[model samples]
Target: SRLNRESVIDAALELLNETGIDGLTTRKLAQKLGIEQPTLYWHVKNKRALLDALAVEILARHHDYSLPAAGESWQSFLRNNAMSFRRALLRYRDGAKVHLGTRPDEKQYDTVETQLRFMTENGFSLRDGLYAISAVSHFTLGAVLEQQEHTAALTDRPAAPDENLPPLLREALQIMDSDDGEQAFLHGLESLIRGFEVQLTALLQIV
Candidate 1:
């Protein structure tokens, strides 16, 4: 129904793959496409539209998200989905960057919907599920972005969060070294689930 939809999106993706979000612009995209800059406007109205399009395209390609086994608990489901998303983002250049601040919306929301529903059906309160999902998603995105920045040699050293953070954060930072994202992510998820269990038990006791 849209003209040059796929072509324009493909070009934007190619440009993103070559240069990160910071380096992508209508002028650069047009230069890369070998077309007049204004032509991009015909396909994408503005920069926000382009970023949203890229996010949608990324979600559309994530159809291979692993499903947990029939008897597998929601903890396993959460971990698998998080790891699958992390892996998918790593598969492409600046993929995580493409989705840094975007949230699920009507045009692109299945993965998020599935994840939230999965959590809810597993005894997590809507509020708790949203909180846990936000924690996990943000942790994953931040980790991948830092890893990418490191690979680009943007910074010579990791920020010593321990020095600037509170005591608990400092202690946690020591254990959460450069390459502990997967382990730390799972640990956080498991702890959140455990916390939910405690809350559920309390509610049952009152009932």
Candidate 2:
């Protein structure tokens, strides 16, 4: 068995699921891999580096819709990509937290360029295309972060109704309680894509 980069990251992800982002430490990772601290350090410098690798690996493993298929509409691509991103972020415990503030890996540069090219071919300047992707990413990240936090705090007992809450607030809570948050996520995703459509049309008109 080789203790290479992939092996190290593999062990780290396994440790991550058991311990979560905060609890995941290099020492623990070394123990998990049956390697000494110096050997593990050869693969990853510290917890931060390991986390950065995990963030990239998460996407590489679970984000299947990063690039649009041939002839796919930009709107469709955006929707699918966001959905895939959300799924990936929700795949592991504190997954979204693992991704938060992590730097992009060099391997992602080509994929990101292709995404931007797709946007431009469909009708966006490079800057606008980047912004569109960033907007979708930010929205999905926020949604997943909230969902993960809620999942962490979830209890076996059902929530007790609060009588002190206002009528509208109670109704909103009821709506949220009805589903596993997919309905709200889809609604927001559609709104974002539709907004992009409007902007695309406006850009077309101006050109």
Candidate 3:
């Protein structure tokens, strides 16, 4: 089998699942690939470059999700987009973490253009369109990260709270004590989309 850049990225991705992000060092990756550390460097200059590749791969996966067809409301279009991205992230272990520092490839440009065109043509100003799109992305990232953390905590949760965790502290902790975080994530995303809807309506009226 040939040892190329693609192989390096694939090996790194495999490493991510085995060791999570923190443990995906070049040394470990090389060891897994059965290659010398220097040989790995020839394919990827450093950890940052390697991560950039990984990030690109993450976004590129399941990258075919597109904007909604004609007559679909902007909100639905955006929601679908976020869901598709979230699905890709959910497929891989620590996907959201990988996405946090992603550098999108050329393939994403078309999607980005479609998103902006829909928003601006629908009624939003260019600036507002950018803002709305950016908000959706960040919101998705936070939601995914929260979900990951929630799952990990339950899998290795600490013992029950001490006798006195302070009333306010206990109350705060109790705010979301559910075993699953998906419902909470969906609720928050819905709230964000609703808020954006209001802002979009007002922005359109002014345009």
Per-model TM values vs. the true structure:
0.73, 0.90, 0.82
Q: Which 10 consecutive residues of model 2 have the lowest summed lDDT?
A: 152-161
Q: Write the per-residue lDDT of candidate 1 for residues 105-164, one digit (tens) a residue.
A: 686466567777777787778888888778767877887787776666646666554456
Better of 2 and 3 by TM-score: 2
In order of TM-score, best first, we have 2, 3, 1
Q: What is the C-alpha lDDT of each candidate?
A: 0.73, 0.87, 0.77
Error of 1 at 87 (Å): 1.5
The alpha-carbon deviation from the true structure for residue 33 of candidate 2, after best TM-score superposition, in angstroms, is: 2.0
Off by over 4 Å in 3: 63-66, 150-157, 162-179, 203-207
Model 1 misplaced regions, further than 4 Å: 1-3, 66-72, 155-207
Strongest candidate by lDDT:
2
lDDT tens per residue, model 2, 69-163: 88899999999999999999988889999999975689899998899888999879899998999999999999888877877767755776687
Clashes of each: 0, 0, 0
Task: Give the poorly placed runs of model 2, Cα more than 4 Å off.
Answer: 154-161, 204-207
